[PDB]
PDB file of C-alpha atoms in Angstrom:
ATOM      1  CA  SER A   6       5.638  15.563  -4.753  1.00 14.04           C
ATOM      2  CA  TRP A   7       4.746  12.420  -2.808  1.00 10.93           C
ATOM      3  CA  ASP A   8       1.483  11.383  -1.153  1.00 11.92           C
ATOM      4  CA  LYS A   9       1.149  12.026   2.574  1.00 15.98           C
ATOM      5  CA  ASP A  10      -1.293   9.194   3.322  1.00 19.30           C
ATOM      6  CA  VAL A  11       1.180   6.484   2.294  1.00 21.11           C
ATOM      7  CA  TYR A  12       4.032   8.309   4.082  1.00 19.82           C
ATOM      8  CA  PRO A  13       2.438   9.852   7.194  1.00 22.17           C
ATOM      9  CA  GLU A  14       4.047  12.651   9.165  1.00 19.09           C
ATOM     10  CA  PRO A  15       2.726  14.591  12.161  1.00 21.30           C
ATOM     11  CA  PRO A  16       2.341  18.360  11.831  1.00 19.27           C
ATOM     12  CA  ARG A  17       5.434  19.969  13.304  1.00 16.89           C
ATOM     13  CA  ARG A  18       5.432  22.261  16.344  1.00 16.68           C
ATOM     14  CA  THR A  19       8.310  24.753  16.281  1.00 19.51           C
ATOM     15  CA  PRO A  20       8.912  26.933  19.364  1.00 16.26           C
ATOM     16  CA  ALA A  21       9.342  30.686  19.011  1.00 14.70           C
ATOM     17  CA  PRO A  22      12.837  32.115  19.671  1.00 11.84           C
ATOM     18  CA  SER A  23      12.698  34.079  22.937  1.00  9.32           C
ATOM     19  CA  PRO A  24      16.281  35.096  23.771  1.00  9.10           C
ATOM     20  CA  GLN A  25      17.404  35.984  27.273  1.00  4.58           C
ATOM     21  CA  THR A  26      20.705  37.714  26.402  1.00  4.95           C
ATOM     22  CA  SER A  27      21.935  40.620  24.283  1.00  6.04           C
ATOM     23  CA  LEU A  28      24.613  38.854  22.224  1.00  7.02           C
ATOM     24  CA  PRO A  29      23.356  38.294  18.648  1.00  7.84           C
ATOM     25  CA  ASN A  30      23.489  34.659  17.596  1.00  6.57           C
ATOM     26  CA  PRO A  31      25.382  34.049  14.322  1.00  5.57           C
ATOM     27  CA  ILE A  32      22.743  31.527  13.190  1.00  4.29           C
ATOM     28  CA  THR A  33      20.225  34.217  12.200  1.00  5.53           C
ATOM     29  CA  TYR A  34      22.838  36.273  10.328  1.00  6.93           C
ATOM     30  CA  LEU A  35      24.146  33.187   8.519  1.00  4.89           C
ATOM     31  CA  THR A  36      20.577  32.162   7.656  1.00  4.24           C
ATOM     32  CA  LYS A  37      19.846  35.610   6.202  1.00  2.47           C
ATOM     33  CA  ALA A  38      23.063  35.351   4.188  1.00  2.00           C
ATOM     34  CA  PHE A  39      21.918  31.888   3.061  1.00  2.00           C
ATOM     35  CA  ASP A  40      18.643  33.112   1.570  1.00  2.00           C
ATOM     36  CA  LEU A  41      20.563  36.088   0.165  1.00  2.00           C
ATOM     37  CA  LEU A  42      23.515  34.472  -1.620  1.00  2.00           C
ATOM     38  CA  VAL A  43      22.268  30.898  -2.178  1.00  2.00           C
ATOM     39  CA  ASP A  44      18.478  30.587  -2.264  1.00  2.00           C
ATOM     40  CA  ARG A  45      17.782  33.472  -4.663  1.00  2.00           C
ATOM     41  CA  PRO A  46      20.036  32.369  -7.597  1.00  2.00           C
ATOM     42  CA  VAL A  47      19.065  28.710  -7.113  1.00  2.00           C
ATOM     43  CA  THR A  48      15.371  29.615  -7.216  1.00  2.00           C
ATOM     44  CA  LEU A  49      15.911  31.862 -10.259  1.00  4.17           C
ATOM     45  CA  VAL A  50      17.686  29.058 -12.146  1.00  6.58           C
ATOM     46  CA  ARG A  51      14.933  26.621 -11.160  1.00  7.39           C
ATOM     47  CA  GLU A  52      12.304  29.110 -12.374  1.00 11.60           C
ATOM     48  CA  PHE A  53      14.064  29.354 -15.746  1.00 13.74           C
ATOM     49  CA  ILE A  54      14.295  25.552 -15.979  1.00 13.05           C
ATOM     50  CA  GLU A  55      10.610  25.240 -15.042  1.00 15.70           C
ATOM     51  CA  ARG A  56       9.651  27.745 -17.753  1.00 15.47           C
ATOM     52  CA  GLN A  57      11.654  25.752 -20.312  1.00 16.41           C
ATOM     53  CA  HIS A  58       9.918  22.570 -19.137  1.00 19.11           C
ATOM     54  CA  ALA A  59       6.491  24.217 -19.360  1.00 19.60           C
ATOM     55  CA  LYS A  60       7.324  25.175 -22.951  1.00 21.95           C
ATOM     56  CA  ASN A  61       7.418  21.468 -23.949  1.00 22.36           C
ATOM     57  CA  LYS A  62       5.050  19.119 -22.104  1.00 21.80           C
ATOM     58  CA  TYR A  63       4.482  15.369 -22.419  1.00 22.56           C
ATOM     59  CA  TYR A  64       3.231  12.594 -20.168  1.00 23.79           C
ATOM     60  CA  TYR A  65       3.995   9.062 -19.015  1.00 26.79           C
ATOM     61  CA  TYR A  66       1.752   6.490 -17.376  1.00 28.45           C
ATOM     62  CA  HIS A  67       1.857   3.791 -14.714  1.00 27.17           C
ATOM     63  CA  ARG A  68       1.449   0.357 -16.275  1.00 27.29           C
ATOM     64  CA  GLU A  69      -1.670  -1.537 -15.191  1.00 24.74           C
ATOM     65  CA  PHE A  70      -1.962  -5.329 -15.196  1.00 27.65           C
ATOM     66  CA  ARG A  71      -5.284  -7.136 -15.350  1.00 26.13           C
ATOM     67  CA  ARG A  72      -5.915 -10.225 -13.234  1.00 23.25           C
ATOM     68  CA  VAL A  73      -5.136 -13.614 -14.799  1.00 21.89           C
ATOM     69  CA  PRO A  74      -6.349 -16.818 -13.057  1.00 24.47           C
ATOM     70  CA  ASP A  75      -3.811 -18.051 -10.523  1.00 26.33           C
ATOM     71  CA  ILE A  76      -2.151 -21.446 -10.082  1.00 23.89           C
ATOM     72  CA  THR A  77      -5.084 -22.886  -8.105  1.00 24.88           C
ATOM     73  CA  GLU A  78      -7.246 -22.941 -11.258  1.00 23.20           C
ATOM     74  CA  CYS A  79      -4.462 -24.129 -13.580  1.00 25.79           C
ATOM     75  CA  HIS A  80      -4.322 -27.655 -14.963  1.00 26.77           C
ATOM     76  CA  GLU A  81      -1.110 -29.455 -14.062  1.00 29.65           C
ATOM     77  CA  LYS A  82       1.568 -29.700 -16.781  1.00 28.69           C
ATOM     78  CA  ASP A  83      -0.371 -27.128 -18.831  1.00 27.18           C
ATOM     79  CA  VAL A  84       2.337 -24.530 -19.419  1.00 27.09           C
ATOM     80  CA  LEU A  85       0.058 -22.052 -21.222  1.00 24.64           C
ATOM     81  CA  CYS A  86      -1.876 -21.144 -18.065  1.00 27.65           C
ATOM     82  CA  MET A  87       0.858 -21.898 -15.529  1.00 26.95           C
ATOM     83  CA  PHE A  88       3.218 -19.444 -17.250  1.00 28.05           C
ATOM     84  CA  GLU A  89       0.724 -16.606 -16.790  1.00 30.21           C
ATOM     85  CA  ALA A  90       0.008 -17.673 -13.203  1.00 31.97           C
ATOM     86  CA  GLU A  91       3.728 -17.723 -12.367  1.00 33.28           C
ATOM     87  CA  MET A  92       4.272 -14.316 -13.989  1.00 33.76           C
ATOM     88  CA  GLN A  93       1.415 -12.884 -11.920  1.00 35.92           C
ATOM     89  CA  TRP A  94       2.845 -14.487  -8.772  1.00 31.15           C
ATOM     90  CA  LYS A  95       6.311 -13.015  -9.381  1.00 29.78           C
ATOM     91  CA  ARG A  96       4.867  -9.538 -10.013  1.00 32.25           C
ATOM     92  CA  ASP A  97       2.877  -9.825  -6.780  1.00 35.48           C
ATOM     93  CA  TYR A  98       6.022 -11.005  -4.956  1.00 37.85           C
ATOM     94  CA  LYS A  99       7.974  -7.919  -6.036  1.00 40.37           C
ATOM     95  CA  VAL A 100       5.046  -5.673  -5.045  1.00 38.03           C
ATOM     96  CA  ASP A 101       4.892  -7.231  -1.569  1.00 35.78           C
ATOM     97  CA  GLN A 102       8.650  -6.797  -1.162  1.00 32.12           C
ATOM     98  CA  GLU A 103       8.247  -3.086  -1.846  1.00 34.14           C
ATOM     99  CA  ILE A 104       5.286  -2.902   0.575  1.00 36.29           C
ATOM    100  CA  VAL A 105       7.434  -4.339   3.381  1.00 34.98           C
ATOM    101  CA  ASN A 106      10.152  -1.869   2.356  1.00 31.56           C
ATOM    102  CA  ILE A 107       7.659   1.006   2.714  1.00 32.36           C
ATOM    103  CA  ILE A 108       6.692  -0.140   6.214  1.00 33.54           C
ATOM    104  CA  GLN A 109      10.373  -0.424   7.215  1.00 34.66           C
ATOM    105  CA  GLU A 110      10.949   3.118   5.924  1.00 33.71           C
ATOM    106  CA  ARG A 111       7.958   4.279   7.992  1.00 29.28           C
ATOM    107  CA  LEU A 112       9.404   2.673  11.128  1.00 27.80           C
ATOM    108  CA  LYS A 113      12.852   4.219  10.641  1.00 31.64           C
ATOM    109  CA  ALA A 114      11.303   7.631   9.933  1.00 33.00           C
ATOM    110  CA  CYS A 115       9.219   7.383  13.121  1.00 30.34           C
ATOM    111  CA  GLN A 116      12.262   6.453  15.216  1.00 30.89           C
ATOM    112  CA  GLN A 117      14.404   9.287  13.847  1.00 28.48           C
ATOM    113  CA  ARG A 118      11.596  11.851  14.110  1.00 28.08           C
ATOM    114  CA  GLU A 119      10.718  10.968  17.701  1.00 30.02           C
ATOM    115  CA  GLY A 120      14.320  10.832  18.897  1.00 28.80           C
ATOM    116  CA  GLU A 121      14.536  10.170  22.641  1.00 30.10           C
ATOM    117  CA  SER A 122      10.889   9.084  23.093  1.00 29.46           C
ATOM    118  CA  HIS A 123      10.888   6.597  20.218  1.00 28.90           C
ATOM    119  CA  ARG A 124      10.102   3.508  22.298  1.00 27.84           C
ATOM    120  CA  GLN A 125       6.808   5.054  23.446  1.00 28.68           C
ATOM    121  CA  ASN A 126       5.740   7.313  20.575  1.00 28.31           C
ATOM    122  CA  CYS A 127       6.177   4.697  17.817  1.00 30.09           C
ATOM    123  CA  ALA A 128       3.962   1.855  19.042  1.00 29.79           C
ATOM    124  CA  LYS A 129       1.634   1.891  16.020  1.00 31.19           C
ATOM    125  CA  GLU A 130       4.492   1.797  13.501  1.00 28.81           C
ATOM    126  CA  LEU A 131       6.105  -1.108  15.360  1.00 32.46           C
ATOM    127  CA  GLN A 132       2.806  -3.017  15.438  1.00 30.95           C
ATOM    128  CA  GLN A 133       2.278  -2.444  11.702  1.00 30.77           C
ATOM    129  CA  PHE A 134       5.851  -3.580  11.038  1.00 29.09           C
ATOM    130  CA  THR A 135       5.338  -6.732  13.114  1.00 30.23           C
ATOM    131  CA  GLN A 136       2.074  -7.540  11.307  1.00 27.34           C
ATOM    132  CA  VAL A 137       3.508  -7.092   7.813  1.00 33.04           C
ATOM    133  CA  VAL A 138       6.685  -9.026   8.718  1.00 30.29           C
ATOM    134  CA  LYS A 139       4.618 -11.904  10.136  1.00 29.16           C
ATOM    135  CA  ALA A 140       2.464 -12.047   7.008  1.00 30.98           C
ATOM    136  CA  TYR A 141       5.504 -11.855   4.696  1.00 27.95           C
ATOM    137  CA  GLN A 142       7.223 -14.641   6.642  1.00 26.38           C
ATOM    138  CA  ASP A 143       4.104 -16.808   6.516  1.00 22.99           C
ATOM    139  CA  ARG A 144       3.724 -16.104   2.786  1.00 22.95           C
ATOM    140  CA  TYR A 145       7.210 -16.233   1.258  1.00 20.66           C
ATOM    141  CA  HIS A 146       9.855 -17.648   3.607  1.00 22.28           C
ATOM    142  CA  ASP A 147      11.832 -20.903   3.247  1.00 24.08           C
ATOM    143  CA  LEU A 148      11.172 -21.356  -0.463  1.00 22.43           C
ATOM    144  CA  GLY A 149      14.752 -21.308  -1.764  1.00 22.05           C
ATOM    145  CA  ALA A 150      16.524 -19.755  -4.716  1.00 20.96           C
ATOM    146  CA  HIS A 151      14.285 -21.728  -7.110  1.00 25.82           C
ATOM    147  CA  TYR A 152      11.012 -20.366  -5.723  1.00 27.89           C
ATOM    148  CA  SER A 153       7.821 -20.721  -7.745  1.00 26.25           C
ATOM    149  CA  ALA A 154       4.058 -20.526  -7.319  1.00 24.56           C
ATOM    150  CA  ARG A 155       3.816 -24.289  -6.767  1.00 24.83           C
ATOM    151  CA  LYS A 156       6.204 -24.189  -3.797  1.00 23.66           C
ATOM    152  CA  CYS A 157       4.226 -21.311  -2.276  1.00 22.72           C
ATOM    153  CA  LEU A 158       0.974 -23.230  -2.787  1.00 25.71           C
ATOM    154  CA  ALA A 159       2.493 -26.331  -1.169  1.00 25.09           C
ATOM    155  CA  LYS A 160       3.713 -24.290   1.813  1.00 25.73           C
ATOM    156  CA  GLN A 161       0.293 -22.669   2.234  1.00 23.87           C
ATOM    157  CA  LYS A 162      -1.436 -26.061   1.985  1.00 21.18           C
ATOM    158  CA  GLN A 163       0.879 -27.490   4.648  1.00 22.24           C
ATOM    159  CA  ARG A 164       0.241 -24.482   6.905  1.00 26.74           C
ATOM    160  CA  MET A 165      -3.546 -24.781   6.571  1.00 28.27           C
ATOM    161  CA  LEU A 166      -3.320 -28.541   7.179  1.00 31.37           C
ATOM    162  CA  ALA A 167      -1.312 -27.916  10.356  1.00 28.82           C
ATOM    163  CA  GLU A 168      -3.746 -25.213  11.511  1.00 30.69           C
ATOM    164  CA  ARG A 169      -6.774 -27.449  10.887  1.00 29.34           C
ATOM    165  CA  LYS A 170      -5.127 -30.372  12.702  1.00 29.20           C
ATOM    166  CA  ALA A 171      -4.185 -28.174  15.678  1.00 24.05           C
ATOM    167  CA  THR A 172      -7.760 -26.873  15.785  1.00 24.47           C
ATOM    168  CA  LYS A 173      -9.021 -30.475  15.748  1.00 23.76           C
ATOM    169  CA  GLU A 174      -6.783 -31.378  18.703  1.00 23.51           C
ATOM    170  CA  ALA A 175      -8.222 -28.524  20.805  1.00 22.69           C
ATOM    171  CA  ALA A 176     -11.895 -29.015  19.900  1.00 25.37           C
TER     172      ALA A 176
ATOM    173  CA  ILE B  30      16.285   3.509 -25.608  1.00 26.18           C
ATOM    174  CA  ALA B  31      12.979   1.664 -25.169  1.00 27.10           C
ATOM    175  CA  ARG B  32      11.672   2.962 -28.509  1.00 24.46           C
ATOM    176  CA  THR B  33      14.844   2.300 -30.520  1.00 20.81           C
ATOM    177  CA  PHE B  34      16.476  -0.886 -29.212  1.00 22.47           C
ATOM    178  CA  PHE B  35      14.258  -2.715 -26.716  1.00 23.51           C
ATOM    179  CA  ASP B  36      11.437  -5.137 -27.467  1.00 22.09           C
ATOM    180  CA  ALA B  37       8.019  -4.572 -25.951  1.00 23.52           C
ATOM    181  CA  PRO B  38       7.063  -6.697 -22.916  1.00 20.24           C
ATOM    182  CA  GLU B  39       3.893  -7.813 -24.719  1.00 19.86           C
ATOM    183  CA  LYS B  40       5.906  -9.091 -27.690  1.00 20.42           C
ATOM    184  CA  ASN B  41       8.237 -11.045 -25.395  1.00 19.13           C
ATOM    185  CA  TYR B  42       5.255 -12.371 -23.411  1.00 16.90           C
ATOM    186  CA  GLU B  43       3.438 -13.716 -26.465  1.00 17.32           C
ATOM    187  CA  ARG B  44       6.666 -15.033 -28.016  1.00 16.41           C
ATOM    188  CA  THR B  45       7.349 -16.953 -24.795  1.00 15.39           C
ATOM    189  CA  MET B  46       3.797 -18.333 -24.838  1.00 14.33           C
ATOM    190  CA  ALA B  47       4.256 -19.562 -28.423  1.00 12.34           C
ATOM    191  CA  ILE B  48       7.614 -21.141 -27.527  1.00 11.60           C
ATOM    192  CA  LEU B  49       6.109 -22.910 -24.508  1.00  7.99           C
ATOM    193  CA  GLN B  50       3.229 -24.261 -26.606  1.00  9.45           C
ATOM    194  CA  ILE B  51       5.594 -25.603 -29.284  1.00  9.53           C
ATOM    195  CA  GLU B  52       7.935 -27.371 -26.857  1.00 10.34           C
ATOM    196  CA  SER B  53       5.016 -28.758 -24.823  1.00  9.29           C
ATOM    197  CA  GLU B  54       3.543 -30.311 -27.973  1.00 12.86           C
ATOM    198  CA  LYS B  55       6.968 -31.705 -28.910  1.00 13.79           C
ATOM    199  CA  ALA B  56       7.423 -33.271 -25.460  1.00 13.34           C
ATOM    200  CA  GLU B  57       3.993 -34.930 -25.506  1.00 12.97           C
ATOM    201  CA  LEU B  58       4.750 -36.241 -29.003  1.00 15.63           C
ATOM    202  CA  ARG B  59       8.047 -37.711 -27.754  1.00 10.95           C
ATOM    203  CA  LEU B  60       6.352 -39.474 -24.831  1.00 10.92           C
ATOM    204  CA  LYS B  61       3.648 -40.871 -27.125  1.00 11.09           C
ATOM    205  CA  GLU B  62       6.368 -42.083 -29.512  1.00 10.75           C
ATOM    206  CA  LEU B  63       8.147 -43.948 -26.714  1.00  9.96           C
ATOM    207  CA  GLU B  64       4.891 -45.562 -25.559  1.00  9.96           C
ATOM    208  CA  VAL B  65       3.945 -46.558 -29.125  1.00 11.00           C
ATOM    209  CA  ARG B  66       7.397 -48.054 -29.763  1.00 14.56           C
ATOM    210  CA  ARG B  67       7.202 -50.059 -26.528  1.00 13.78           C
ATOM    211  CA  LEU B  68       3.721 -51.373 -27.370  1.00 14.68           C
ATOM    212  CA  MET B  69       4.628 -52.357 -30.934  1.00 16.17           C
ATOM    213  CA  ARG B  70       7.799 -54.062 -29.718  1.00 15.15           C
ATOM    214  CA  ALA B  71       5.736 -55.978 -27.154  1.00 14.96           C
ATOM    215  CA  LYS B  72       2.842 -57.102 -29.361  1.00 11.58           C
ATOM    216  CA  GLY B  73       4.064 -56.768 -32.948  1.00 10.01           C
ATOM    217  CA  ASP B  74       0.613 -56.125 -34.420  1.00 14.79           C
ATOM    218  CA  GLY B  75       1.486 -52.760 -35.967  1.00 14.60           C
ATOM    219  CA  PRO B  76       3.552 -51.603 -38.945  1.00 11.35           C
ATOM    220  CA  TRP B  77       6.854 -51.511 -37.021  1.00 10.10           C
ATOM    221  CA  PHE B  78       9.068 -54.426 -35.927  1.00  8.80           C
ATOM    222  CA  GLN B  79       7.625 -56.548 -38.747  1.00 10.25           C
ATOM    223  CA  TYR B  80      10.496 -58.960 -39.181  1.00  8.22           C
ATOM    224  CA  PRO B  81      10.142 -60.918 -42.442  1.00  8.92           C
ATOM    225  CA  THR B  82       8.650 -64.385 -42.724  1.00  8.17           C
ATOM    226  CA  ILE B  83       8.418 -66.729 -45.704  1.00  6.96           C
ATOM    227  CA  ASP B  84       6.274 -65.516 -48.596  1.00  6.40           C
ATOM    228  CA  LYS B  85       3.516 -67.964 -49.528  1.00  7.15           C
ATOM    229  CA  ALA B  86       3.792 -67.280 -53.272  1.00  5.64           C
ATOM    230  CA  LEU B  87       6.593 -69.874 -53.528  1.00  4.49           C
ATOM    231  CA  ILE B  88       4.313 -72.856 -52.828  1.00  7.72           C
ATOM    232  CA  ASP B  89       3.511 -75.226 -55.696  1.00  5.44           C
ATOM    233  CA  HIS B  90      -0.146 -76.291 -55.709  1.00  7.80           C
ATOM    234  CA  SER B  91       0.056 -78.530 -58.780  1.00  7.74           C
ATOM    235  CA  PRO B  92      -0.624 -82.267 -58.311  1.00  7.64           C
ATOM    236  CA  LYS B  93       2.542 -84.150 -57.417  1.00  8.94           C
ATOM    237  CA  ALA B  94       3.781 -87.654 -58.229  1.00  8.75           C
ATOM    238  CA  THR B  95       2.411 -89.044 -54.945  1.00  8.30           C
ATOM    239  CA  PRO B  96      -1.172 -88.273 -53.839  1.00  6.60           C
ATOM    240  CA  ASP B  97      -0.203 -88.158 -50.142  1.00  6.77           C
ATOM    241  CA  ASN B  98       1.261 -84.679 -49.705  1.00  4.35           C
TER     242      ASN B  98
END
């Protein structure tokens, strides 16, 4: 299964069925027929498949990457270190793209789960989405199709220069 | 598929590093060659662009018919 801390969900609160009439609803009868004719053979087949899988067990692992020095401590026109720095930067870039994807999935899940009170009950998810979108836009936007670590470093240097200059104007 | 046909990422990584080292050395050698050729064309003190002059082994140092020579 998945991890509930990365993908949060509130505990559900299901009301009890308290009917006010005498006509039997077909939903309960159809549900009982559903666990009779459908759920039992499906669960039996899954139990057999799980037994066959428990007969032969093997594992796989999540690949771990150690930290290589980045482009800020790389000599210019020294491809041996810049290649590793650029590979690390591209791996980080893909990881951040999936992080923003996770936050978008959280926001959509919150909206669908809350339904008609989504614009009040999903303030925290919207704030998290705004924060991660702002940081992604300040980190990776307007680079082009030929993006590299040097362009990102130049953009960050220009942003810090602008921030320092704007601080100096208002000091 | 990964065990039978595909190369490991580590093998590709180190092969790319070796390739980058080789072409970087070749490019620096090419730039040094262009600079050396320009300098030896300009000054002419090195082994290249040594256009021939007259060999001095053809001079006769024996006494001539006239002392003033």
